[model samples]
Target: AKHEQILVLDPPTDLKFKGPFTDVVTTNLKLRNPSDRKVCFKVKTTAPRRYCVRPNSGIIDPGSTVTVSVMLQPFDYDPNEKSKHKFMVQTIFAPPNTSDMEAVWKEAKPDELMDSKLRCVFEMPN
Candidate 1:
């Protein structure tokens, strides 16, 4: 379709925080290509408290969809802490003729581009 856009037909995401930061939160994401030709996707995940971003590390093929799974572990704070934390997920065009991994992940704000965004609140297990 000429008017069709390469969008997230089904935004893939799943997260759960258990007691203690020792527990890992699992995530699933999907990238879909709806255009006539193939399209590539670059994925990135941002941790809470403006922690160091893990950077983009995945890709999706053209005219197809890809599923990505991730596990999150705390580096400093405890997940049991009573506060809301924000995690941002994003993707961008995988530029051609780029060998550097840095050039592959296009800097983007998921909120501005993707249709799915989540802000999670961690609660201590009773």
Candidate 2:
């Protein structure tokens, strides 16, 4: 890849969520492909068990935009403690005629892929 990251992200920094602490909260992340080539991307979380991401991994057609829904699992109330949760959007340009994403991911070197970091921000109810 010529640039550091292959895709453009909206809400560029934090993925914020408000909470009652007793229910699941969902956050949406928009991914845009600004390049002329197709790309494959994946959403990975530091606290995987505490979160659920739909379409965690997928292919982004050239000049296409897509969104992923990430749900935060219900948890015990704790506003005093700062959250250390983190997420990463990893991506790589798709090879021509590639049908299997898993194999492509497995064989890719660390430098072959580009990634953007994101953090989870929790806010109290107003």
Candidate 3:
């Protein structure tokens, strides 16, 4: 086994979102690839309507970084303590000879597929 994998997440952990939500708040998820090979990934959240991610699924090229814009959707702010929010990143080594990055996820090997979790932290602007 050589290097194993090169997927690293920056913001290191837990993506924090600002409070005083007027409309939609933006949080950036930076995906870094430190390996020589490309990797494919998709982002999923516990609250889909609560958060929207663009370029949710994409390929991270060798020694490169991909910026994923995650927007917190409009919702009524409640302090009653709703269910905790979370994000899970599913990844796998990308298949060679592909473009859209749309189909290879299905081809992922169950044994080798890798993933990680992130927290959705809420911050009070005031």
Candidate 4:
């Protein structure tokens, strides 16, 4: 417990897409590790499935920050006035000596565990 530290990674509050999204949209996600020990994480997403993430899984050194490039592909779809295409980004931390999910869940400390979620919305003109 004394050796454990909090992860300081934060995703964007939300993402927006207006009409005529012919070109791809991209953004940089900043990840910070404030702990004294190195941290590794795996990235996952939900819905649309039209995107790419570079270096999605990696180790972040202690007291350091890293940038993740996210690119969303363009799609053609008509809106239903209030309808929207939604997506979610999730990050799950991996503990040492065990990249296995089961092991991490059983042996990882509270501070050693971290997860983040981000929401996105794409809207089309009516």
Best by lDDT: 2
Where does model 2 exceed 4 Å of error?
Answer: 1-3
> Candidates' lDDT values, in order?
0.47, 0.88, 0.78, 0.60
TM-score, candidate number 3: 0.85
Give the distance in Å from residue 32's predicted Cα in candidate 2 to where it truly belongs. 0.4
lDDT of 1 by residue, 28-96 (tens): 555576554434444444453332332334555666776655456664555446444444544445556
Better of 3 and 4 by lDDT: 3
lDDT by residue for model 4 (3-87), tens: 3224554554555555566888776677787767767766555643787777666777888888877677776655654423333
After superposition, candidate 3 runs with Cα above 4 Å error: 1-5, 79-83, 99-103
TM value for model 1: 0.47
- Model 2 steric clash pairs: none
Stretches off by above 4 angstroms in model 4 are: 1-5, 10-12, 16-20, 77-112, 123-126
- For candidate 3, write residues 6-103 as lDDT tens digits: 57887766898886666898999898988788888888888887889998888888899999898997666765654388888887877776675555
Q: Candidate 1: how large is its RMSD?
A: 6.0
Q: Of 2 and 4, which scores higher on TM-score?
A: 2
Q: Order of candidates by lDDT, top first? A: 2, 3, 4, 1
**Taking the tens digit of each residue's C-alpha lDDT, what string does model 2 give over 1-126?**
335997888868799988876999999999999999888999989998999999899889889999999899999868897778998999998887668777899988878899899988988888
Best-fitting candidate, scored by TM-score: 2
